Amino acid sequence: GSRRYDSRTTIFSPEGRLYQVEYALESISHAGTAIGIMASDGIVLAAERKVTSTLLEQDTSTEKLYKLNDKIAVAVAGLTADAEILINTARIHAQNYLKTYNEDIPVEILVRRLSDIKQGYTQHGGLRPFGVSFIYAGYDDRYGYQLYTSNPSGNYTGWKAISVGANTSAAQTLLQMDYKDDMKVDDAIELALKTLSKTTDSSALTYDRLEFATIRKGANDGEVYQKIFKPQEIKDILVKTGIT
Amino acid sequence: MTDRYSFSLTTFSPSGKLGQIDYALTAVKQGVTSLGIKATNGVVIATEKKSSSPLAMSETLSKVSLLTPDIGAVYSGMGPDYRVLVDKSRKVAHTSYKRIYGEYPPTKLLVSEVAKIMQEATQSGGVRPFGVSLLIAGHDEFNGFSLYQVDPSGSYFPWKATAIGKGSVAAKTFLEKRWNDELELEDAIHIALLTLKESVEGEFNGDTIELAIIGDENPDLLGYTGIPTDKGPRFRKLTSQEINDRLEAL
Amino acid sequence: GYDRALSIFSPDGHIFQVEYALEAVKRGTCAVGVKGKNCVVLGCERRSTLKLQDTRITPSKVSKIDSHVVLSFSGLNADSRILIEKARVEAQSHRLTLEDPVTVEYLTRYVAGVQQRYTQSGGVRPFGVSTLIAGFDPRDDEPKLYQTEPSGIYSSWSAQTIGRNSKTVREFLEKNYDRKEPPATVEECVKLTVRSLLEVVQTGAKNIEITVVKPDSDIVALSSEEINQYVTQIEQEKQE
């Protein structure tokens, strides 16, 4: 019958590893680098677009940074199509929580549920896993500013600063070097860009090859604002830090 | 009996490649060249009509398809896969949008729905990916004119101008030299015909070329009068004669 | 639905998928359980290759199943969340129908049953997780410590360890733990647990987690400074 053609996506190796999860992580390692840095008064999300073409429409584009709700955003690393499936699920889950409790969903609860979906594809169903790693940046009234990451295994962990995608080994060393706990948002913006500038596989880091976003309490009195940076705004912040 | 193929036929290889998607892209490479160019006051999409036989009527086979009154589509790759995608794309525009909001979806969201269908063929049980890349041109009130590409993986990207299929590498280079942000629609049509002549080998006329535009509203193509807000479709397929007129002053 | 029998017998009478799930447990960070005269202590390793971590929000290794029972584990982290969720649901379901919280033995038997079901169900792989379940039965002061594993077998332990380098720490406990006289106090039990982890861990900074459980739903997690005091005390006595 059909047994002949089954790849058996949800099995263990002799060494106790999940083949497909490991190979999905290998796929993600070739994706454009995405960095998240958490400060005391906000969070930065920076991401490198995959080898841009000059005729690509830059201003009306979205590849790396997606909005989940007013208080939570994600940076993507891997297959964009796979990420969008998961993102719409996450957007729906957040609204279900708001509908049920009349309160914005706590960041971890959203992350756990999305991570549990990934886990399911590794244990049952016979389907390939989602070739996606997320960086979750968000705020709630319990834990304040939070950074998480999830990967195809369905395992998630919290971070002060973290990178996913390509050159994470080199990127994590640079972040570990210059990061400190009493850091401000404006300083974190500078660190994020400097790290990408050194770990990039491109010749020089430019505005058209980047996506950028912040989550500050910079709005008027005790409320959070999400700022997805425009092309011209990235051009300005790149000059202001002295990279171009 | 029954579909026993409930498992994925597309899986990750040790190197991290999704084989079936890569092979689907290879099928698109073999396909005939199609392109799209965005102007300030419109969008143009074009392709060569590769005829299987001279006895065949190439008018009956339409490579450029209307999805909504303001959105059109063209492809490169496997024709049959494209035909069913157009059917599904037209239906999803109604079921998941028009029947809810009482209006046609904006270009980006319809593209998103088509991308979802193509992504599912990459992960669902007992199916192969679609062997096509789409170029979807459209207009909507709040976003204006837009042009999108959609790949077998389900990934989509917005373009100022681009090409896909056989001679896409050369065609993209040609478009980089000619494209600017001040192009009028007629200028974009002219450039589209120049670009397409390079990839076409045999006859080059209105009968062998298929070309449509997303431009101004067409009250004459609406089919009725009396409602001021309804002004007609922005999608218009250029006729065989209309193409030949522009080939003289080329 | 996906029906494939993934867990099956081999010529020599082994179920490789279950045995490979044990290899995943062997890869996981070390976890230790030691029960005293009036308490149980759960110790856990945290690997130090991960700096720039946020310990406030990062999932803790020890999880409360109910107010009186806790569960730690070694192996795949994502898999553990599924067992913990099911266990928490069953704990509340038991209170609802029996009008009494679960015993530690019952909760262990349930979790072990879930693990077993995944070893002979079509379309699923076994859990790559072994658990240490500890606590006190309702209106009871006798300490309980149980272990489970992917196959579905479970049993009670005076003291036990699981995860990477667990055979080393089990060797330590086998000579240091006396059945006739277990750790009489909380301090003695925690010290023996920390000592056992210090045979394997590396440094006693932010690598060791300790959780103490006492009778009548009295559970508390130790902070860095509190644990560091045990580390400082043990090293000074060692130099002799």
Add this chain to the structure above:
Amino acid sequence: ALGATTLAFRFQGGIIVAVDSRATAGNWVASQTVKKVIEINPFLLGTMAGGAADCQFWETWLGSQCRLHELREKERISVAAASKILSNLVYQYKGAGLSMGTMICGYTRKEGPTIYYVDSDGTRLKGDIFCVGSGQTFAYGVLDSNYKWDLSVEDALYLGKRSILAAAHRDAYSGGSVNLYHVTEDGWIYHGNHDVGELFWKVKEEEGSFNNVIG
């Protein structure tokens, strides 16, 4: 559709359970020898009021569930848990037309003597004294006025017997005979069948009650 008088009360020495024996189909007396105490197991008792079949069937079913509980947990089932198994079950059938009014009685270590009134519309009440049936009012009157926690086992057995007699006399749909039970921690003890015909005349003479009746 069953007229009955059933009672059960907690006291110093455990639980007394007492019931009548009559079954009627309208005015027609079908039986005088009905067993309205269901022996769920050696430690648990159940009373039958409302539907005869509903009470028999589901309280026998309950004994099967209690046996499975102690096989898996190696411990006697609580009266609380046993009563809740039954109440949760009839709640599932709510609206379908089940008819029950029962007292689940037991004596354990952690609880002591315990009685739960369980009913077909989902009610589950813990209490000290319960009376159920067409003759419950008559039995309550004797119980309330004479009940004390520090009753002896002999006096408690008589009180339950006398309370059923009171109802059997006045309530047309109650009578036949009286079945007594004493529930202890070590199990229940049957205290015989007592024909109301012979019992009435005996109590009249010895007690001096029922002067309205010529004998």
Add this chain to the structure above:
Amino acid sequence: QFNPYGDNGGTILGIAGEDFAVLAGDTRNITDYSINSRYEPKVFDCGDNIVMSANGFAADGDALVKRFKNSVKWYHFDHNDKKLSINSAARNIQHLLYGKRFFPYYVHTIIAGLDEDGKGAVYSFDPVGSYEREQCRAGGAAASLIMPFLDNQVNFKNQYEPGTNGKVKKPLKYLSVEEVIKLVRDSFTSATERHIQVGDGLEILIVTKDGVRKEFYELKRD
């Protein structure tokens, strides 16, 4: 509107002796004021020395008996030809009846046989499955006529020892099979006189350790 139930009349009677048991029933089947059959048996030998009757709505009665006979057959298959005891059969029938608690069999069921000590046994069921063991039980149309007579002659109710000031009851005792059949015949002839649905014929099934014997007696046909 369609009414799925009907009344086929008839009456049945089960008495239990010391080492025997009888199950009697009239052979008349009716609808409204018409006679369908003057001889339509409704007491059956079901095997394992168990006799059974389900009186009321005949269609439901035949279905139940048919299902129980089938239940006996499968008890032998599944349990190495073990003999089904009368008490086990009773419990089994409860589950058959209660299985249709919300669309009942409109029948009064009675079974007779010998218990495991060899003593006579009779069990009676309500339409939804409640059951009880009894010495004496009448069921059906004329149960109200027959039953108080049995109370008086079998269980000696309301009969006191002569001269004892009504202080000493008449002593209970087992009756012979001959004395029981006399009471059965007199019970049915009396019911035949005063109940229109009772008559035509009387069929009795007697159960001893030796087996199942039958006896038939004519009744008035008006």
Add this chain to the structure above:
Amino acid sequence: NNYDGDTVTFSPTGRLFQVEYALEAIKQGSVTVGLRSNTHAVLVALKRNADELSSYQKKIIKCDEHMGLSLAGLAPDARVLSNYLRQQCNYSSLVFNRKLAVERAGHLLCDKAQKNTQSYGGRPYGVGLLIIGYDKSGAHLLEFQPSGNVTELYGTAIGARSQGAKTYLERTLDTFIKIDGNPDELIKAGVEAISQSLRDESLTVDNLSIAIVGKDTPFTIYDGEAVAKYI
């Protein structure tokens, strides 16, 4: 070789190997014999034990008052098929008040076994059956094979060394067919037939198993001291 992975695959020569491997399980099974006259039909079965401490595996199963079979091969598969026969016999009685014909019984077993040989996932039955019975057209003996093939016979035998008993019955055909109105003599012929398949072992009191059905005889099984008469 490459064509025996499952039952859905044909070999290049047109063979179904999984069905043939199921047939092999019957050959390993203990011997059982079937034979009939015009008035009666008899089953004789050699029971097998694990060791001296164990019991002897029961080979004969009753299906109705007028029908039953003996088994050889996987016993659980015989339980499934015998249970199916019990239901079909029973369906015929409840619905049509009719005793199921022994020929229809065979047709039903054939069709049930067949479905397991044409579909993916499932497997063939691993047991052979000898069905006897007495219906409206007299005595009958059937041989069931898990390929689906059912055959009506005067006599036969299946299991290990069944060729010896089958040869004997082929010689004795004219004699035992006319044993009418004599149960004990028909059994004797069956016991002598199964004796031709014995090696080293002989027929003992708790080893032999006999069953009979006929004109005025319900299907009944004889074991233990009840078969001491025929040794």
Add this chain to the structure above:
Amino acid sequence: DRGVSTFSPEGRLFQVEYSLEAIKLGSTAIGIATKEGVVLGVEKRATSPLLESDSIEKIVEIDRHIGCAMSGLTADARSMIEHARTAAVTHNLYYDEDINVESLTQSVCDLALRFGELMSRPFGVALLIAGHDADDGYQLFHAEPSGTFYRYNAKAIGSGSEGAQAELLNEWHSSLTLKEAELLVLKILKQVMEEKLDENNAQLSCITKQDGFKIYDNEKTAELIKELKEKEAAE
């Protein structure tokens, strides 16, 4: 790979034969049947000294008149026991009586072959089912994952089964008392066990008509072990 319900050329089910190899790796379990009762005994086999041996539950009650001992992948036995207990109690509910030991065993064995492509694989555990009923008296059954069950006068299963079975062949007779049977299980267990036999690493049980199924205490078994050693030294 290959199908789960596949036959070998020799006419056996691969997966059933492979599960039998798993049972040979399991700890030893012995059962002996007498006219005074049936005795069941098992090797606990703790993997480490820190493991509390009293939590090792390899002898199990099904009903008051039926007991059970296991050997092999013991986790697989949980659902078998659950089914057996339900079957026993359900039969009592339907028929107001105790269920025959053979009928109980048959019900358990019906699960055995309900696997394929139902559960994904056969059970990797063998069971000794001991009990009493009014018809056939004291009985001992051996239930395999093949769906087959044999009745036995005495039977050993597990790693030391072939050696223990040969010993049971010589020692068993029809006039064995209950006390004699108890000692005989301990004697044979001590012979095949790796570690030295005591009350903590071995467990006894029995089933009698009068008192029903009972698992022996460690104190009671310890005295029977001491009684056994003295009798062997006495000649």
Add this chain to the structure above:
Amino acid sequence: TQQPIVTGTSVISMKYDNGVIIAADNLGSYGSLLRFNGVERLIPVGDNTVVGISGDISDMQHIERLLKDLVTENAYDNPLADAEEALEPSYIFEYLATVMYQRRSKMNPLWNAIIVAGVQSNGDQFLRYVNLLGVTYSSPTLATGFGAHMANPLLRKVVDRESDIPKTTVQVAEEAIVNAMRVLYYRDARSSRNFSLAIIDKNTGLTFKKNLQVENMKWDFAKDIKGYGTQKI
């Protein structure tokens, strides 16, 4: 839940020494309207059974189809289909009775009253009734509808009990049936003069008589009847 539309009235039958007789008129009423006059309500099954049906005609035509299909199915893989393993009246009856009870238990009955008359393989007479409720009974005489009230009393004067069956000839039994059909024509408002009659004999087999008419009727005395009491003219 149904209501009958096009209906058939009484079906009458009885046993005699060597076999059974059954009869029914050829009418299909539509309420008070005597709409259809060529309706056959006796349906033979083989050469040894006749099923007589009253009540809803659409449900009768459904049963005709079931019986026809039953004969076809019995012949499948059956060499003795015209001999030992042919369909018996008892087989045909039990099948219908099973169906009728199943349909009433789904609250969707076949609105009919059926009488199965025939002769068994051993020569025994078979006569049994079943209706929309699944109720079954047997008797020396059986009738449906008005026939139960008017025919049975006349047929029971001939065969009052079991012992009267050997004493009753086919000539006498047929005479009683034909007389009963006349009485029903006098007194049943939904009856017709035309009818069918069938005899199943153990020796002479199945005799099916069509297009019979009620005759030898008494109407002459009507001329003498004037007014409703006092009227003389």
